[PDB]
Structure 1
């Protein structure tokens, strides 16, 4: 699946850089330059989920070339949203690397103009949508699905940045309730509900109750997903993850820190307190030591299994009337 999807990327790029009012040529050359560098190099879990869900939802007889194309197009739309969020996330998180290369905003000659660059990527989604699905009866729903999903993420992000003030030890606020809402808004909606709900709308399924049912499954899925992203932030092979963790020095409200706090003694708390949210490398090293002390990696592992089962029950409880494989597929690719 992955490869046919990626090969359609040359069509996306050329269409978005088509127009050539040559007054804007330099600007378009820069856009393509932004697309190449930030859309390529990920797993495509989101773009791929749109394509694959579409195939499993639309009558095969009804999968003409045209409609097939609108599907990976809307798939590259979810990847553009991803790219937009990442370029700006890496700046606000002050990241060094992403997807095995330096962050776009760390490239010599880019810096904070990457803010505009990210906005362009956001703009491209809507450019593609009008360019391929304008005469379709789901046009508004897709557009509306991307707008609201963007808002929900911005809100989650706001939550995030709010719970991790810089220069401020924020231990008190790392609760579970809090973590659950952050993750729901900043990751789950756009990474799990969005690409599937887009396939649904494309397959003519726009009922409110089906979408809610899929949502019930997809959100909880998305939560587990972020919890994995957190574990991997600290406990993962960068060469594999293509980026380096910052949550700790960024005083983030991670699943990890939320777990340490629920298992630590006063003596451990204070270690945590004088050590979390600081740039000092050994201070960061101190916290990981706590976590490893507290057996959190086994705990995470225990979670993955407890979680995998819950979602499974969920798919059981709510997949209908969609082919269960729509979700199983997702769960399989994000269950390691």
Structure 2
């Protein structure tokens, strides 16, 4: 659409500013410049731009109802795009490191960045680090004189930290808590006692929901100078609820959506993740099903993986997904209605974000 081509045009400006800076200030050679250019394209582009386009949507909502000079309108949209790219690049940073940590093979229908032959884990770790640093270069350069600069940096820091904390909860979600010990190699849980909805909710709240929904929605408010015009407690509740749903969808897709469609190859069963499928299965299985799950979960062996998928299909988790979805539809609509008391415009943005999320097939 544009909107999205216009958003991508701002990516072009940001890439040129970043790479011209590397040549002019960081003594970079043209071949390392080209490597960082392809790195940025491979890691930042080719997705749906949900996060970045969410900040644009929120900004456009307020521009429709607020009086501004034309030049001001132009500035607000451009700030929305740059703010949207900071999040897309923060996401890029997490996905590069996540793919290494998850042992994944494909991202956005291409090899994970670390699996590019001329990349490898060694470089990719540091390239993911660079992606996050570029987010701060963008912010300091583009928003230097903006009133919202300090609030934005502080919120960005907290979202980032929550995400890294969340990634720790995730990567250790298959170990017994009482057995974590840097000194002792971590064995997988045999009881699965920590595969509960509460624990699942905590992992997901931190690892995903701050950056996929909370940050973009509040960033759209910041660039609009409209933050004080919403109830922040409601923004957070609805972010965390739509975020959790987004991650539940991701978990279902990891197992059940063909890689040609999804653009990734699922690893949750083999990595022994505390996914929504595993928790929900365990929430309804009889003693024999639990037993068979335990004998097959968290192994690379394709025959073992197939048994778990069979257990999932037989357990009729599509009923559970339907009942979970219907509950979230209830809760999201209820939050949108509460948002409209102070912010009809922001509520409608949340409605659109919800609608796009709910219908994605990724």
Coarse TM-score class (shorter-chain normalised): over 0.9
- The 5-angstrom pairing of residues 289-304 of structure 1 reads 289-304=310-325
1:273-288 equivalent positions in 2, closer than 5 A: 273-288=294-309
2:64 paired with 1:64:
no
Does the CA contact (< 8 Å) of 2:174 and 2:273 recur in 1? Answer: yes
Counterpart check, 1:76 vs 2:76: no
* Gapped regions of structure 2 (runs ≥ 5): 176-185
Note the C-alpha offset of 1:178.
0.2
Decide whether the 8 Å contact of 2:59 with 2:76 is kept in 1.
Answer: no
Contact kept, 8 Å, 1:77 with 1:128, in 2: the verdict is yes
Cα distance in 2 for residues equivalent to 1:121 and 1:142: 18
* SS of aligned partner of 1:263: coil
The CA deviation at 1:212 is 2.0
Match of 1:32 in 2: 37
After superposition, what is the alpha-carbon deviation per residue over 1:31-65, rounded to whole angstroms, capped at 9, x for unaligned?
22211111111000000001110111242525432
The 5 Å alignment of 1:162-241 reads 162-165=172-175, 167-170=187-190, 171-207=192-228, 210-241=231-262
Instruction: Say what the alpha-carbon RMSD is for the aligned residues.
Output: 1.7
> Which of 142, 147, 161 does residue 157 from structure 2 map onto?
147
Cα distance in 2 between the residues matched to 1:167 and 1:107: 30
Q: Secondary structure at the match of 2:145?
A: coil
Please say if 1:102 is aligned against 2:77. Answer: no
Alpha-carbon distance between aligned partners in 1 of 2:340 and 2:267, rounded to the nearest angstrom:
36
**Structure 2: how far apart are the matches of 1:7 and 1:207?**
30
Select the residue among 131, 151, 156 that pairs with 2:141: 131
Cα drift, residue 67 of structure 1: 2.6
Shift in Å at residue 211 of structure 1? Answer: 2.0
TM-score normalized by structure 1? 0.95
- Shift in Å, 1:242: 0.4
Structure 1, unaligned stretches of length 5 or more? none
CA deviation after TM superposition for structure 1 residue 131, in Å: 1.3
Pairs within 5 Å for 1:306-317: 306-317=327-338
Q: Greater CA deviation, 226-235 or 316-325?
A: 316-325
| Aligned-partner Cα distance in 1 for 2:89–2:272 | 28
2 CA distance for matches of 1:154 and 1:214? 21
Alignment correspondent of 2:356: 333
Give the Cα–Cα distance (whole angstroms) in 2 for the partners of residues 169 and 281 of structure 1. Answer: 20
Q: CA deviation at 1:259?
A: 0.6
Q: Contact (CA 8 Å) 1:153, 1:189: kept in 2 or not?
A: yes
Asked if the contact 2:10–2:78 (Cα under 8 Å) also holds between the matched residues in 1, the reply is: no
Paired residues in the alignment total 336
Contact kept? 2:229, 2:342, Cα under 8 Å: no
Cα distance change, pair 106–246 in 1 and its aligned pair in 2 (3 A): same
- In structure 2, C-alpha distance between the alignment counterparts of 1:94 and 1:309, rounded to whole Å: 36
Q: Report the CA distance shift for 1:208/1:281 in structure 2 as closer, same or farther (over 3 A).
A: farther
CA contact (8 A) 1:214 1:319 kept: no
Question: Structure 1 pair 279/17, CA: closer, same or farther in 2 (3 Å)?
Answer: same
The answer on 1:11 being equivalent to 2:13 is yes
Scaled by the length of structure 2, what TM-score is found? 0.89
